[PDB]
Amino acid sequence: DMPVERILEAELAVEDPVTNICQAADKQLFTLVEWAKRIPHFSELPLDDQVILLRAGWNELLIASFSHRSIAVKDGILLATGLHVHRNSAHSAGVGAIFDRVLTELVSKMRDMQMDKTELGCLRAIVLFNPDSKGLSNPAEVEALREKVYASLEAYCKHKYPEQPGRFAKLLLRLPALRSIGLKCLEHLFFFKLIGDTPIDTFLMEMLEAP
Amino acid sequence: DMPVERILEAELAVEDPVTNICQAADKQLFTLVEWAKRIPHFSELPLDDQVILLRAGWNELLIASFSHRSIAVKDGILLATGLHVHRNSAHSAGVGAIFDRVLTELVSKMRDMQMDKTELGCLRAIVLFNPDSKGLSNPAEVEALREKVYASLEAYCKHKYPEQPGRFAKLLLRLPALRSIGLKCLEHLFFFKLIGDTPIDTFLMEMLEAP
Amino acid sequence: HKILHRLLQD
Amino acid sequence: HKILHRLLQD
Numbered sequence: 001d002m003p004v005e006r007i008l009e010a011e012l013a014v015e016d017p018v019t020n021i022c023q024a025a026d027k028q029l030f031t032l033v034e035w036a037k038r039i040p041h042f043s044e045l046p047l048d049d050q051v052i053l054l055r056a057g058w059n060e061l062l063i064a065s066f067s068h069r070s071i072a073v074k075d076g077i078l079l080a081t082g083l084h085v086h087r088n089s090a091h092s093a094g095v096g097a098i099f100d101r102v103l104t105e106l107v108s109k110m111r112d113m114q115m116d117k118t119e120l121g122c123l124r125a126i127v128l129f130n131p132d133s134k135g136l137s138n139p140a141e142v143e144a145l146r147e148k149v150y151a152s153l154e155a156y157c158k159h160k161y162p163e164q165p166g167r168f169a170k171l172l173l174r175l176p177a178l179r180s181i182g183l184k185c186l187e188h189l190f191f192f193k194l195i196g197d198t199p200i201d202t203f204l205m206e207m208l209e210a211p
Numbered sequence: 212d213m214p215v216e217r218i219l220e221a222e223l224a225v226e227d228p229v230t231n232i233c234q235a236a237d238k239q240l241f242t243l244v245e246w247a248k249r250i251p252h253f254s255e256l257p258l259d260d261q262v263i264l265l266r267a268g269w270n271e272l273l274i275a276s277f278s279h280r281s282i283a284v285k286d287g288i289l290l291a292t293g294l295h296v297h298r299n300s301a302h303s304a305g306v307g308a309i310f311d312r313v314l315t316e317l318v319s320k321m322r323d324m325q326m327d328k329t330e331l332g333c334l335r336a337i338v339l340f341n342p343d344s345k346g347l348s349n350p351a352e353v354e355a356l357r358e359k360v361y362a363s364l365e366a367y368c369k370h371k372y373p374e375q376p377g378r379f380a381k382l383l384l385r386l387p388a389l390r391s392i393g394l395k396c397l398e399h400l401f402f403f404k405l406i407g408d409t410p411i412d413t414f415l416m417e418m419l420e421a422p
Numbered sequence: 423h424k425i426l427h428r429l430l431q432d
Numbered sequence: 433h434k435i436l437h438r439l440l441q442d
Contacts (some may be wrong), residue, residue, distance in 0.1 A: 033439045050440050051433055105343050132316050132388055150380045169361045172383045176390040177343055183394055206435050244429045261430050262423055417425050 002148035007121035010038035026201035067106040213359035218332035221249035237412035278317040333364040
């Protein structure tokens with residue numbers, strides 16, 4: 001089984017600007033590992049596959065988390081360090097475009113639909129169990145777990161928001177945006193690493209290593 | 212309304228290797244415009260918005276089409292020019308990685324689920340009506356059309372494949388893969404253009420212009 | 423974007 | 433990937 005209550009529990013258990021964002025990201029990578037261990041069946045996968053899923057998903061997973069954390073923030077994001085970062089600050093640091101995509105495609109859409117923590121948890125678990133991740137010893141097994149998450153999520157939405165028949169599809173359709181922003185985020189991080197002005201801490205650095 | 216029968220009709224109406232793929236892509240861009248005009252309500256949008264949606268979606272739209280066209284092809288893709296391109300040929304031209312992603316994440320998954328032309332049509336229409344496209348004069352209007360497509364698609368899957376309750380979510384969850392492969396495709400095209408060895412024809416070139 | 427505009431016009 | 437392995441181990 002894949003009970004949405006366990007997924008919610010996982011979320012609840014873990015609850016210039018470029019430098020601050022990068023520092024916050026490094027910090028949250030530790031927390032991400034703890035989150036993943038709390039998702040049903042993840043820790044039962046082979047260690048090598050747990051590594052692959054987390055290396056494949058970490059940036060989307062962190063982006064989804066700070067985006068949902070920021071739904072009551074006007075034109076900004078709330079980092080896990082407690083720091084609010086506004087649009088103007090990101091623009092003045094040369095990362096306005098990517099920052100605005102986060103705000104318009106993720107944060108404001110999460111706000112508009114009042115995406116809840118169960119739904120966020122499920123989307124994150126779907127991202128985690130990515131069966132397209134290269135090198136998985138058993139892709140079908142990860143595919144099975146993803147299928148169980150989205151079954152439970154659809155059941156949850158239909159029970160909790162029966163007057164919103166499109167809500168489930170609406171949730172899933174933020175995933176392409178999440179993927180694209182995740183990819184653009186990586187491009188920036190690789191550049192910061194290349195230029196070498198911004199400090200990149202050890203876990204974030206490791207995520208930027210070749211496989 | 213957004214009848215799946217009109218969407219199916221749209222699909223039916225329009226039915227080294229790097230050079231060949233690029234040439235085929237240029238050819239299919241003309242056909243894509245004709246396809247889009249056949250999708251309910253697209254031609255009613257402001258001309259400027261039609262331009263924006265097509266410039267935003269063309270590469271994903273073409274990739275989805277040749278991927279579905281190739282489901283009965285072993286380890287290869289069928290171009291609209293009639294030419295079959297095998298894995299080995301793409302690998303020997305230095306584009307093996309992106310080619311394999313098409314095969315594993317799109318073609319083989321479409322094959323495994325027997326994605327039908329109605330479903331393909333709907334996924335393409337959802338891609339077309341992308342409300343996150345920058346510059347849209349009315350994003351809510353495009354969002355409304357997307358919502359109508361996915362409502363009709365869910366109705367279609369539940370009626371046509373009632374024994375497969377996960378099928379609808381399964382379709383939508385190929386869209387992140389489509390987005391990522393679309394982005395990687397663009398990176399390659401920009402490089403081919405930069406190096407200047409591969410001929411890039413006028414419409415494909417125009418798509419590679421700045422907005 | 424002259425080609426796309428021309429083709430969409432009709 | 434030594435940090436991730438160490439943290440997942442327990």
